[PDB]
Design a protein around this ligand. Structure first.
Ligand SMILES: C[C@H]1N[C@@H]2[C@@H](O)[C@@H](O)[C@@H](CO)O[C@@H]2S1
Ligand SMILES: C[C@H]1N[C@@H]2[C@@H](O)[C@@H](O)[C@@H](CO)O[C@@H]2S1
Lengths: 626, 625
């Protein structure tokens, strides 16, 4: 029933798509572009005037219109967005490659929220002609898929920015034991600077990207910690590593220029190579030769300061001030916390966004890139962080969160507080809320039974009912979550598992020590087989979730991890049985006293911690090393 | 049997060894003599047996039983080429040899002619005040190490711990506590010059000093990035050959404090001082390093290790390279048991014969046979007995003419039957002189839907080879006595491989041909059966492991095999979804398979070397962030 005047055909088609998310009421709306504001909406009694500064801003304007019209007839909206560009970057390199259909849904939602820009982070997960091992069995996007994704974003006047790697974070590529790949290597996950075959590869990266319309790219260059120290050192000897970086940076910028690209890079290696203790968060002594080189290069690249951790504006401001010593062409990357296992932390994301937004505004930052990393196997749902995305959008357009829940429900059908219950498996009640990375969702799940190396981080009196209540809270939200139900069903089941598994290893030890054989038998014969049944159920839900959002490729690692967990539970059953049958004097596993897993949060009152590597969660034995 | 001339200690040791060998009802006069390593004369039921060194009595007895089984008259005289022959067991790759198996190993080593038993322990021995060192790894207590040693002493066999004082400490340094992290340079390497590192090393030697032995191998191999991590950040750039010497001096000073005499792997001197970072190089020694190194080389024996060469002259070249630095050298050879589930006694033989030639020509005094367990310790500890008997024969006789007979006396199997244990590796079109080709492992752990090693499979030959191996090994199991477990495990493995070698390919063929009957059959019959077979193999493997090793470290294999099983279920479920019409394609099967590696791409055969579980099993990330 909605009637619009002043739209192009492109804008009317975009709106039809968006009717799949939002419900437009029966009113008349005159639309025009105007520089007066990012978004303005006025009128009453069913006749409204809507203006946008930039085309893509029509779609957030419509979300605002729908929302405000439910509680009032008169409308006085005026928004002035703080940032020239607000982007969302999805991790497609951690095993989870967003599928094209899910990319389109994400684009639609981002448009409704007010984002200008959609980005995919692809280390090796885009195809390059003549590089058959690059993205092999990883579900690398074809050039056609990226074009499709980008053209879809272009239907909403949302631009596309690929985030690639031109130095390090190429582990999945460089592992292939063929001459054509090994000759490109320096050390660990780092390409060999100065090798012409490496610049042939990088040229090929841009040949693929040049098939897109976009001429904006993030070239990576973060976290190349041993750059110059491997095969580079053997071949070339000791060199000034700050200058090595500039040299490599210059070659890459020249290749980009060849294709007409404008580059951004992560900023951290400048700080780590030019500070005394090799850290990001440092004031730097720039050697003069490097200063002269950076002075040239700074006019050709945007440096991206990334920080997901600080709880105050001042901390951000300090780093911004450090960055100004190098360059005033800066962007900021904030965090949509979805990289700590199975379960996001939209809560923590909200806490730090508020403070990062203050700092970005103070330093006239042109662009914020919200980053959804998927560290260590991509086990968190791609749509798990919609609340964090709306949060950053509200902060840009309105500089407050007053409209957050209403805008969110208009866009998704859920209140933001219901949706943010998705975080529950991380939200142990005794955590302060301002400390990052505390991820019991993941380490309680993948921990062994017989050898429970995180057991000192468990607080069963608190944790068991928290997890138990969370599973019920989430089944209730699932029932009202519409097409988002899958996300909550997955989390409810996980929480149900963690309710019992959080201390099953401890109860086995207490029974063993107390010589309570009836209890060991109960655990071995009833509880553990049921635990496997529940984990299998969870695996089925996870798989459904994964196949909805992502390509099939990379799910294999989760199959392996979860099958291993299941087999280790069976071991706990069988070892207990052998003991019960009188054919073991002792169960040696249980004779070992448990130590703290890590001391990272050892001085806090709470017991939980951060453990975010599957292979160290699951076993104290060797598993990847030789 | 009746002996004269024995001590109480000797008569006690012979009692134990009757558990392995059958002494005939004969009269033997025993005396020490310097005339030969071993001598045996006599006839008509009366024999004279001499030995040079006490432990050599036990080889002599194995010899006597053997020769008497087809002759009344005996004329034996052996002169061993090596002052010491040792076997070193890897107890650091997850598999920690349990005490009961240590005792069986010592007994067999005694019968073969070995003077020395060694255990390689990175973090798998207990250090007071270092609770994370060996944590949940089954680290030997001092009491256990003392027990293993005293048991070896019963046979006049000496004990030498092999430890790590620089790198190869990855299982220790992973632990994210300040007490451990402060000790780190980079990767698996300790931080040279950090006093808490030297506190740790002092603790290592405090544990070992509880032993009687005062001989130790201090490690120091393969510290490739030494100086380039935290060391570089804290201290800046330094001469890495001088850095090495500094650290080596600290370590030898600690050893001296506790009375130890040290050996070390020699590779880092060559790698740090060669231009291309390689071991097999004649190196120019920087002047300051030469001064430092000349001091140090008088305090440590260098161990040249090499397992891979089929020619004497390659060994000799490296001996020459070593002699430019020092003449205080020992040699380490290999009993190949570090390439998965299945050993390579055949390749071990090939290289032993040539290495023995080179060692003799360079007047090497001690040979250490090394039984590494790379990447999870999945090969059985007693899988390499033939390789051990080979080195013993090469030392004492300089040939293998007595090999099978002495082996049979010692184990109950002919050496030919025992070495069938290798079969999962012995693909028919391989030449026998190329190292590391291990289809036993990569055929087993490969995925079904995404078979990244498929190009290395030759089903026309591999399939019957493996099927025929399973039958052969089932026959040998039946005559193998207490070694039956070893063959039973391998028989089941070969049975699995005969179908798994191409199941991934046949799924792909069926899919492309649109042979849905065959996709159904594979999904509903063959793959569930394959899982049942793998579960049985897991059961057999577990039995073997728990018989030979401590329980710790089996968890990794559970994890790995658990994951394989779960991936086979995924193969089944993805095919069913396709068959039900709920996918237009199975994307996994649309990917063209490339060579896994080009390491042996120049050769006529398709097989290769692939010895990392995590890269065998998936092309996705799995340990990286
Ligand atoms: C520049 C980026 N490099 C890293 C990225 O790959 C993620 O692992 C992320 C979250 O852990 O941390 C940093 S931010
Ligand atoms: C000095 C030793 N270092 C390595 C050892 O740890 C094993 O990995 C072995 C077999 O691959 O290779 C070498 S020999």
């Amino acid at each position: 029933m909605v009637r619009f005047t002043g739209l192009s055909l492109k804008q009317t088609q975009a709106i039809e798509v968006l009717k799949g998310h939002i419900s437009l009421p029966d009113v008349e709306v005159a639309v025009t572009q105007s520089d007066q504001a990012s978004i303005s909406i006025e009128g009453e009694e069913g006749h409204y005037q809507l203006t946008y500064r930039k085309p893509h801003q029509l779609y957030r304007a419509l979300s605002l219109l729908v929302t405000v019209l439910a509680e009032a007839d008169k409308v006085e909206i005026e928004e002035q967005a703080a940032y020239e560009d607000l982007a969302y970057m999805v991790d497609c390199s951690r095993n989870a490659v967003l599928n094209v259909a899910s990319a389109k849904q994400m684009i639609e939602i981002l448009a409704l929220m007010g984002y200008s820009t959609f980005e995919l982070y692809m280390e090796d997960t885009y195809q390059i002609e003549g590089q058959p091992y690059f993205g092999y069995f990883r579900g690398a996007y074809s050039a056609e898929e990226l074009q499709e994704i980008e053209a879809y974003a272009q239907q909403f006047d949302v631009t596309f920015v690929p985030c690639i790697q031109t130095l390090a974070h190429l582990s999945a590529f460089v592992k292939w034991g063929v001459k054509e790949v090994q000759e490109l290597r320096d050390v660990e996950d780092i390409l060999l600077i100065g090798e012409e075959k490496v610049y042939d590869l990088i040229d090929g990266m841009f040949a693929t990207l040049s098939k897109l319309k976009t001429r904006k790219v993030n070239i990576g260059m973060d976290e190349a910690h041993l750059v110059g120290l491997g095969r580079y050192l053997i071949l070339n000897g000791v060199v000034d590593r700050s200058l090595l970086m500039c040299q490599h940076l210059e070659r890459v910028l020249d290749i980009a220029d060849k294709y007409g690209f404008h580059c951004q890079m992560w900023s951290d290696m400048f700080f780590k190579l030019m500070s005394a203790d090799g850290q990001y968060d440092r004031d730097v002594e720039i050697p003069e030769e490097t200063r002269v080189y950076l002075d040239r290069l700074k006019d050709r690249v945007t440096l991206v300061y990334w920080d997901y951790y600080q709880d105050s504006e001042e901390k951000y401001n300090r780093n911004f001030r450090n960055h100004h010593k190098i360059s005033h062409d800066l962007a900021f990357a904030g965090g949509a916390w979805k990289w700590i296992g199975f379960t996001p932390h939209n809560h923590f994301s909200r806490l730090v966004a508020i403070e990062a937004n203050k700092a970005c505004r103070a330093n006239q930052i042109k662009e914020v890139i919200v980053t959804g990393w998927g560290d260590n196997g991509g086990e968190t749902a791609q749509f798990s962080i919609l609340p964090s995305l709306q949060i950053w959008a509200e902060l840009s357009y309105r500089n407050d969160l007053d409209g957050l829940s209403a805008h969110f429900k208009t866009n998704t059908g859920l209140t933001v507080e219901d949706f943010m219950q998705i975080d529950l498996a991380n939200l142990l009640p005794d955590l302060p809320g301002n400390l990052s990375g505390i991820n019991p969702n993941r380490y309680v799940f993948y921990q062994d039974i017989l050898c429970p190396i995180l057991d000192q981080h468990m607080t069963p009196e608190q944790d068991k009912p928290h997890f138990a209540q969370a599973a019920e809270t989430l089944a209730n939200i699932k029932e009202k979550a519409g097409n988002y139900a899958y996300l909550f069903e997955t989390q409810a089941q996980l929480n149900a598992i963690l309710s019992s598994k959080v201390d099953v290893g401890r109860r086995i030890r207490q029974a063993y020590q107390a010589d309570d054989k009836e209890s060991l038998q109960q655990i071995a014969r009833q509880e553990l087989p049921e635990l496997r049944s529940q984990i299998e159920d969870f695996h089925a839900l996870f798989s459904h979730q994964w196949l909805k959002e992502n390509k099939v490729f990379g799910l294999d690692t989760v199959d392996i991890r979860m099958g291993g967990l299941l087999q280790r539970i069976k071991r706990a059953e069988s070892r207990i049985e052998v003991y019960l049958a009188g054919q073991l004097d002792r169960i040696d596993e249980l004779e070992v006293e448990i130590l703290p897993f890590t001391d990272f949060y050892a001085d806090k009152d709470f017991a939980a911690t951060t453990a975010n590597q599957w292979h160290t969660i699951a076993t104290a034995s060797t598993i990847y090393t030789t």
